Design a protein around this ligand. Structure first.
Ligand code: WE9
Lengths: 279, 338, 218, 55, 233
């Protein structure tokens, strides 16, 4: 086909954008002394999950579309789905703990950050990653052992328990829907004191609030919606439209540097300095 | 009467100016355009004394060029084994504002001073294995900007009451007071023979004082703003002043007038600390723009920059043996350059 | 590494943990600078230090042309007091607040304002033996700009002056800085009981400003 | 004020009287001093790695 | 005012257990490393155990490694030596010694008294001169020779000289060859090189009779000298 180069190039440019954006964040925290703060630990953790997506879960998907069938072993389809589901969950938890950390800094300005040291600034980082491991990796890597063998066709790579229609809503509720409810409630409450401080003692608050909530709802809801309807009907939505929403879920890792990192002025100055001239 | 002294003071001042001009036989630059330029000196960070949590305001090398005491706004005086980065001691301070710290030449004492208008002296080498306060010198009106040990029993301090004093540590009394400056004395340097000392002040004037007699021998006026740092040339017959007007100048004690000015068009921030080198050819000045410039002392051309701090350089000390330079900034790090 | 250098390193590590522990306890306290004038009631709201803990947060306030301003560049807020009742020196107070506002180091440092002798001010203009317009005539206008004051109406026309004197300290205030640092006018007496809450609430607001700026919601 | 004025003249007389020398004699000393002590300046003259105590 | 007082001990039948206690008073005990050293009735000083400041580093001698326990209580200003399975070779009098460790320090500076206990690879020191008589007013030089170069690459040599007067605890004269201690006359001096060290006692005087020992510090175990004696006539 004459469009194979176009499809790979379309995802190829986005794949390289994601990896270069994340590696800048992981080195900007290191080469710049002003970025070694306590709240910046959450951003580097989010970038770590972001680059894992950009090197393993994205390029392998490019093969699955340019090459019609999955040319890999039984286990070679097991670890990719595990690392994809772990990394994506890890991104949401890091975005969740960022909402909590921002929430208390605004609402407890003199107390919360005072009782937040590097020893206890990495604990919720660990629970952010540990929950991602246990909820997904054991449930996917060793699912065939628990029930028979590979129920998947030999030339496919989908997750086995998309058909079990009780775990799929449970793991979607515990993976996307619950963190989103906490996210918007906290980010709506943060806006309350933002208006209150201006009054007692408005524009840039919304310009950043939407750029961080919308850049997650629209790039992740369609996939979780299709999984909900897929578990009831195996073949009711197009596979190409299933795949586009599947690929759309990786784009949050692309925009995260220009969503949480490139928002900060101290990050912006460092990024401009290295982009203008290599150092 | 009162008017008569006014013209007499002015006329006698003019005789000073005429006497100064007769000694201006030739410019220092005129006769020094024959020596080989130092070129560019490349200094690299060799240590980072992590541990301070606030803005470092002063440091002092020991006479052994091994131990150094550092002062920061966290109320801690730390002695560092710079060879191994080890912390030898950690002295808590009663007042958290330290503008100066000194190391006794013997090594048994350290001096701390700042906004409390008190020079506190700590005994390091003593029984019980801990550092204790030896004396608390009181009597200045303004804040101490600098203090330098002469021996184990005498210390010369500079203050913001436009005065400098010499103390008897055992008695705790001001043996000598030095008056005559109009602005705030911000820096101090003892001569190698510890018989005279300079004290640059905020009135854009620097003065030589006599420790034995207590009389201001000379006064130098060439600057336009606060003089922040001052240091003797290793000869002891000249000193350099770094001023808030963004200019270093090398005054001469015998010629009694300025020799060389170190200024560049693109430099606008002031000068915080000044220290010469062992031979005096290098005039290192710490600036407000986060790095210190290694000026050529006889040539007034920037020979290099030490860009390793992300905040302004507060203190700039050089080892007595010339083997290292230690720079402390508001970044809460000391960097040992070689 | 030697036997004694290993032991020396163990000593250095122990000093490190006490330095970090002491530094951590030093992070739950707020530095406050106090300035103003001589006949101003500095201690009625060589360096004196007072530490008052309001709502479990330590506020260690400090009492002392001003070269040592470079020390107070990490201060949360500089408390300034001007003499409302003392009339024919206010233009000195404006000049002092002018340099503190536009100083090299106090560009991001907020200022709290604590207009003093408020009780004396009310009875100063009621008698009528003091022409402010003769001190400085901006009052010639006497606009009484529309405002709401909890306090009663001025019998002698005193209250507009209560906000008349006050606002000169909010015009120089909003002339340079681009919103980096904020001044907070207040009115206080010598018997105004809970006055440390004003700094606490003002210190609360400033921590938002740095917090919001890092998150770029402002 | 008269006493302070007298002290200023008394101080200035001490300033103008004592002694001075020309710059060329004074400058040639610093030119000679640095060139005489130039062999013991590690900052100016680089030192071997075996002699640097901050390796 | 520095004072280390040792207690416990006494007569124990073999197979039993006994705990010694040393109480410190007069110095910052929390900032000092502490040692336990025994003394056989007619032998020399011997290392037993060492506990660091903060109890983060403990070293026991191979002779009693396993049946000895060392511990300290900084709030109580005391340190203990729990001895179990006492042997017939453990009959000795135990001292407690303080040592601090930083740049320019003088470890093993102060020694305590002794507690009697009667029960019914490594560098080796060479104190060849078992006993040499010296006339008063003259000068005597003692030579030490270990079995290893006692100069480390950091420039720090390692020998501490000790003087054990009759009926008295050992005292520290020199730390690291060429460093006088506190409260010591200037006549004592030391010099030399690796495996070749000498201490000079110029102008020998009264109250200077005793047995001199030689200790290394480059590597635990803390092996001491066999003992060099000086006596009157
Ligand atoms: C789209 N993708 O590239 C592939 C899959 N993926 C997820 N899949 C799910 C599977 C089910 Cl059965 C229910 C819910 C979710 N949502 C997630 C929720 C959190 C983390 C991962 C997923 C990671 C990204």
């Amino acid at each position: 086909v004459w469009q194979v180069v176009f499809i790979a190039f379309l995802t190829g440019i986005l794949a390289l954008v994601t990896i270069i954006g994340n590696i800048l964040v992981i080195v900007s925290f290191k080469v710049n002394k002003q970025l070694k703060t306590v709240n910046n630990y959450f951003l580097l953790s989010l970038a770590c999950a972001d680059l894992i997506i950009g090197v393993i879960s994205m390029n392998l998907f490019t093969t699955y579309i340019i090459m019609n069938r999955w040319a890999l072993g039984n286990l070679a389809c097991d670890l990719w789905l595990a690392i994809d589901c772990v990394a994506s969950n890890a991104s949401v938890m890091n975005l969740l703990v960022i909402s909590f950390d921002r929430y208390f800094s605004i609402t407890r300005p003199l107390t919360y950050r005072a009782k937040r040291t590097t020893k206890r600034a990495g604990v919720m980082i660990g629970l952010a990653w540990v929950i991602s491991f246990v909820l997904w990796a054991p449930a996917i890597l060793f699912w065939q052992y628990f029930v028979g063998k590979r129920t998947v066709p030999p030339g496919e790579c989908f997750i086995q328990f998309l058909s079990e229609p009780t775990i799929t809503f449970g793991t979607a509720i515990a993976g996307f829907y619950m963190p989103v409810t906490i996210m918007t409630i906290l980010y709506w409450r943060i806006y309350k004191e933002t208006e209150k401080r201006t009054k007692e003692l408005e524009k840039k608050a919304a310009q950043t609030l939407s750029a961080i909530l919308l850049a997650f709802i629209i790039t992740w809801t369609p996939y979780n919606i299709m999984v909900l309807v897929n578990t009831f009907c195996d073949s009711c939505i197009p596979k190409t439209f299933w795949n586009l929403g599947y690929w759309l879920c990786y784009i949050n890792s692309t925009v995260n540097p220009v969503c949480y990192a490139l928002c900060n002025k101290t990050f912006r100055t460092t990024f401009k300095m290295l982009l203008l001239c290599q150092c | 009467e009162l008017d008569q002294l006014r013209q007499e003071a002015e006329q006698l001042k003019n005789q000073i100016r005429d006497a100064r001009k007769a000694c201006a036989d030739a410019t220092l630059s005129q006769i020094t355009n024959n020596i080989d330029p130092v070129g560019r000196i490349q200094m690299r960070t060799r240590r980072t004394l992590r541990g301070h949590l606030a803005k470092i305001y002063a440091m002092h090398w020991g006479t052994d060029s091994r131990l150094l005491v550092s002062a920061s706004q966290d109320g801690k005086l730390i002695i560092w084994d710079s060879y191994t980065t080890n912390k030898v001691h950690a002295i808590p301070l009663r007042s958290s504002w330290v503008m100066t710290c000194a190391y006794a030449p013997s090594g048994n004492y350290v001096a701390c001073g700042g906004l409390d208008n008190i020079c506190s002296i700590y005994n390091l080498k003593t029984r019980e294995g801990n550092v204790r306060v030896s004396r608390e010198l009181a009597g200045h009106t303004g804040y101490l900007s600098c203090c330098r040990f002469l021996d184990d029993n005498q210390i010369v301090t500079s203050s913001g009451d436009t005065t400098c004093a010499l103390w008897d540590i055992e008695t705790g009394q001001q043996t000598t007071t030095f008056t005559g400056h109009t602005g705030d004395v911000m820096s101090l340097s003892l001569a190698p023979d510890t018989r005279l000392f300079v004290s640059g002040a905020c009135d854009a004037s620097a003065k030589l004082w006599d420790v034995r007699e207590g009389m201001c021998r000379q006064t130098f006026t060439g600057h336009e703003s606060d003089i922040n740092a001052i240091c003797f040339f290793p000869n002891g017959n000249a000193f350099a002043t770094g001023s808030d007007d963004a200019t270093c100048r090398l005054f001469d004690l015998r010629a009694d007038q300025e020799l060389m000015t170190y200024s560049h068009d693109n430099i606008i921030c002031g000068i915080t600390s000044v220290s010469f080198s062992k031979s005096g050819r290098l005039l290192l000045a710490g600036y407000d723009d986060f790095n210190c410039n290694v000026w050529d002392a006889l040539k007034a051309d920037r020979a290099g920059v030490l860009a390793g701090h992300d905040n302004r350089v507060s203190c700039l000390g050089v080892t007595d043996d010339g083997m290292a330079v230690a720079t402390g900034s508001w970044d809460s790090f000391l960097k040992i350059w070689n | 590494v030697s036997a004694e250098d290993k032991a020396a390193a163990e000593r250095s590590k122990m000093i490190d943990k006490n330095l970090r522990e002491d530094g951590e306890k030093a992070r739950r306290t707020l530095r406050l600078l106090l300035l103003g004038a001589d006949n101003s009631g500095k201690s009625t709201i060589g360096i004196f230090e007072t530490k008052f803990q309001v709502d479990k947060v330590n506020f260690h306030m400090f009492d002392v042309r001003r070269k040592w301003i470079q020390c107070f560049n990490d201060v949360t807020a500089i408390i300034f007091v001007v003499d409302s009742s003392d009339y024919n020196r206010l233009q000195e107070a404006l000049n002092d607040f002018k340099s503190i506002w536009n100083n090299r180091w106090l560009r991001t440092i907020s200022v709290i304002l604590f207009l003093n002798k408020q009780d004396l001010l009310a009875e100063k203009v009621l008698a009528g033996k003091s022409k402010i317009e003769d001190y400085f005539p901006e009052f010639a206008r006497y606009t009484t700009p529309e405002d709401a004051t909890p306090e009663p109406g001025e019998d002698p026309r005193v209250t507009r002056a209560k906000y008349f004197i006050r606002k000169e300290f909010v015009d120089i205030s909003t002339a340079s800085g681009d919103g980096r640092h904020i001044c907070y006018p207040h009115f206080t007496c010598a018997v105004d009981t809970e006055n440390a809450r004003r700094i606490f609430n003002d210190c609360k607001d400033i921590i938002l400003q740095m917090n919001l700026r890092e998150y770029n919601l402002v | 004020s008269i006493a302070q004025a007298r002290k200023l003249v008394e101080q200035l007389k001490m300033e103008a009287n004592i002694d001075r020398i020309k710059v060329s004699k004074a400058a040639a000393d610093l030119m000679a001093y640095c060139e005489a002590h130039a062999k013991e300046d590690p900052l100016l003259t680089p030192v071997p790695a075996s002699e640097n105590p901050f390796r | 005012d520095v004072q280390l007082v040792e207690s416990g001990g006494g007569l124990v039948q073999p197979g039993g257990s006994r705990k010694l206690s040393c109480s410190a008073s007069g110095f910052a005990f929390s900032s000092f490393g502490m040692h336990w050293v025994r003394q056989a009735p007619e032998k020399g000083l011997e290392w037993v155990a060492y506990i660091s400041s903060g109890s983060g580093t403990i070293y026991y001698a191979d002779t009693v490694k396993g049946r000895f326990t060392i511990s300290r209580d900084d709030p109580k200003n005391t340190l203990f030596l729990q001895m179990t399975s006492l042997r017939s070779e453990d009959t000795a009098m135990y001292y407690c010694v303080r040592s601090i460790y930083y740049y320019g320090s003088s470890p093993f500076d102060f020694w305590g008294q002794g507690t009697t206990l009667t029960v019914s690879s490594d560098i080796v020191m060479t104190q060849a001169t078992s006993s040499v008589p010296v006339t008063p007013g003259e000068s005597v030089s003692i030579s030490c020779r270990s079995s290893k170069s006692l100069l480390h690459s950091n420039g720090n040599t390692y020998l501490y000289w000790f003087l054990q007067r009759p009926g008295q605890s050992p005292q520290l004269l020199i730390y690291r060859m060429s460093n006088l201690a506190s409260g010591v006359p200037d006549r004592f001096s030391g010099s030399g090189s690796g495996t070749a060290f000498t201490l000079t006692i110029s102008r020998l005087e009264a109250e200077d009779v005793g047995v001199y020992y030689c200790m290394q510090h480059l590597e635990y175990p803390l092996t001491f000298g066999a003992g060099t004696k000086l006596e009157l006539k």
